[PDB]
Design a protein around this ligand. Structure first.
Ligand SMILES: CN1CCc2cc(Nc3ncc(C4CC4)c(NCCCNC(=O)C4CCC4)n3)ccc2C1
Ligand SMILES: [Mg+2]
Ligand SMILES: [Mg+2]
Length: 269
């Protein structure tokens, strides 16, 4: 049992892992019923891990929203870093999709209204996420899809981007990366909107809109196809079809912008 400020966890309660972090379930030391997720260094990549966790602290401490996983505390030292975060008792969207296979438009709408709420704050703060994918959308059950709360997690690749500048760091997960990102071009806040479009498509159909055998194949696919249109099922409602076609535009200049996304008719209650 390791401790971190007012919190503790055991390395036996692994709930998540990637190349640059490991996450354990834990609790408050006084209030045993307050569950937390404690994110730690992955020693296999010590230096990069330490750098990313440090950056994630800087971003997350500026974001307080019901649809963004909360940072309760953290601890940074020369040779160790910990983030103490909100525990999401529903697991991730990837697992939920594995079980449901596909989601109804009504569930998709509920989830996307919430994601949109978070992105509104990110966009207003000038922050881009750069690793949106089902594994980083988490579910919280306070029961049915109407009560599920969705929270964006994992801000380790996130950055401030000034509104007149472009980013160029190659990061994220290729299946969710905007074309401009995977083709090593400059990109902006609209790269996340492509990722969101891909997540929505995957919820609807159970697959990626543009599949390939490898990252390189996917890249070459995007390179060769200047006109690119996703296959949308015939049964899809008209507003959902419109939203997907507008998000999954290859060329970022043409792609739906934030204001269009936030006010899109598919999101109306
Ligand atoms: C099998 N399933 C695995 C995933 C999972 C996660 C949770 N609850 C959870 N709540 C919050 C968090 C976030 C704030 C730190 C969390 N994190 C792991 C899942 C999301 N991925 C990551 O954070 C990256 C993995 C390297 C960082 N996981 C509960 C059950 C399950 C069960
Ligand atoms: Mg990130
Ligand atoms: Mg862009």
């Amino acid at each position: 049992t390791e401790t971190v400020g007012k919190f503790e966890f055991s390395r036996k309660d692994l709930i998540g892992h990637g190349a640059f972090a490991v996450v354990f379930k834990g609790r408050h030391r006084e209030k045993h019923d307050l569950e937390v997720a404690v994110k730690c260094i992955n020693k296999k990549n010590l230096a990069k891990s330490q750098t990313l966790l440090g950056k994630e602290i800087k971003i997350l401490k500026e974001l307080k929203h019901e649809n963004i996983v909360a940072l309760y505390d953290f601890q940074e030292m020369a040779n160790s870093v910990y983030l103490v975060m909100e525990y999401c008792n529903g697991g991730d969207l990837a697992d939920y999709l594995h079980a449901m296979r596909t989601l109804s438009e009504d569930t998709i709408r509920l989830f996307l209204q919430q994601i949109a709420g978070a992105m509104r704050l990110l966009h207003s703060k000038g922050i881009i996420h750069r690793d949106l994918k089902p594994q980083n959308i988490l579910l919280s059950n306070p029961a049915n899809p109407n009560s599920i709360r969705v929270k964006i997690a994992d801000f380790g690749f996130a950055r401030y981007l000034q509104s007149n500048m472009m980013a160029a760091t190659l990061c994220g997960s290729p299946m969710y990366m905007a074309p401009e990102v995977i083709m090593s071009q400059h990109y902006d806040g609209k790269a996340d909107l492509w990722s969101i479009g891909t997540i929505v498509y995957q919820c609807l159909t159970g697959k990626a809109p543009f599949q390939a055998s490898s990252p390189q194949d996917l890249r070459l696919f995007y390179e060769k196809n200047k006109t690119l249109v996703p296959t949308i099922p015939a049964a899809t409602s008209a507003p959902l079809r419109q939203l997907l076609l507008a998000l999954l535009q290859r060329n970022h200049k043409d792609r739906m912008d934030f204001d269009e996304f936030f006010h899109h008719p598919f999101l109306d209650a």
